[PDB]
Symmetry: D2
Subunit: 109 residues, 4 copies
């Protein structure tokens, strides 16, 4: 548990940083499909939910599993959205990893 | 939808403000059971999740229903925790209302 | 103080909701200049700082004045950015009001 | 700049995680002076401001210097508050480091 918890914390933290950074930088400066309504919203949503999951686990919440389950779903969708664009390889990777760790946390409940 | 969406937004916003305010003020200044580990964490968790739900709906996320479902669960638990303490009547009320609106949003998915 | 504090809280809360909503909806769906790098970042930054100011005041922080001073600066810049675009009248208005209340809070320190 | 920016980002991220974790865990489970109104508020305020600074820099905001200046002030105060309690050595350390990097960012403006 000590290991899994810390592994999901770092994953959510990494994915949150990556989604926010790329959306507010790479995507905004590339325009076109990178700034399409559904994609950008998802990008920000993903950063938001990951940050929430991170905070719940940092605070020792007993509701982390539930929050993580939702986070995994949003991460998977964000990863698929990023598959369409280029230079977004780093985002696809982090969103898949985070989703996997979050699913493991959700399976605890 | 226009009405329900706005109703749940105001409910989450109100409950988020109330939970944060009371936890960081009333509860901290009362000590005793008001600052018990499980209660305070829940209080902050509830404020966090409500703020997340609020942000998802404000941003027009298609994942609001899912997030709201989790928010309703945390709100119900926070409401029960506040039933134990005194001067917490306002928190019980707002947590119940928010949970109800969030359940309505979750039922959309 | 009781009045001023509550007035700045509602102003920050209103401006935060407005900036997030319009950026993630109106601006993203309008494209063009509405999604220009500097403008959108500012929009999100403004929503972020207002949310932080709101949280500091809700929590009874003694550092609210300082945070509010920074919030006023960002709100003024966001208001000017929105003056360029159309349909953004509501954002200009809320950013100016919030900036004024925040300046009043900052003047307390 | 590339180095300094990344150094302050990791510092704020580390300090934010540490303040939230310790406040919601160690301090809440220790009670006594660890849960004193002013100390806990500061702890949460510090986590909040650091998270805001982190987000501003991640998003490439031109207002990071200003936000960081405020963050450094709150970090210094939180570090002094933690000097009073025991087992809080890790928090004192991270709050001092973050404050130093934030001061460097603020000096850019």
């Amino acid at each position: 548990t000590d290991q899994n918890l810390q592994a999901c914390i770092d994953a959510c933290n990494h994915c949150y940083r990556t989604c926010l950074r790329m959306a507010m930088n790479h995507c905004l400066e590339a325009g076109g499909k990178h700034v399409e309504a559904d994609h950008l919203r998802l990008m920000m949503n993903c950063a938001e939910i990951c940050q929430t999951s991170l905070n719940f686990m940092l605070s020792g919440s007993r509701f982390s599993p539930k929050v993580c389950g939702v986070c995994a779903e949003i991460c998977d969708a964000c990863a698929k959205s990023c598959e369409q664009l280029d230079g977004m390889e780093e985002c696809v990777q982090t969103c898949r990893q985070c989703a996997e760790h979050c699913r493991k946390m959700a399976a605890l409940e």
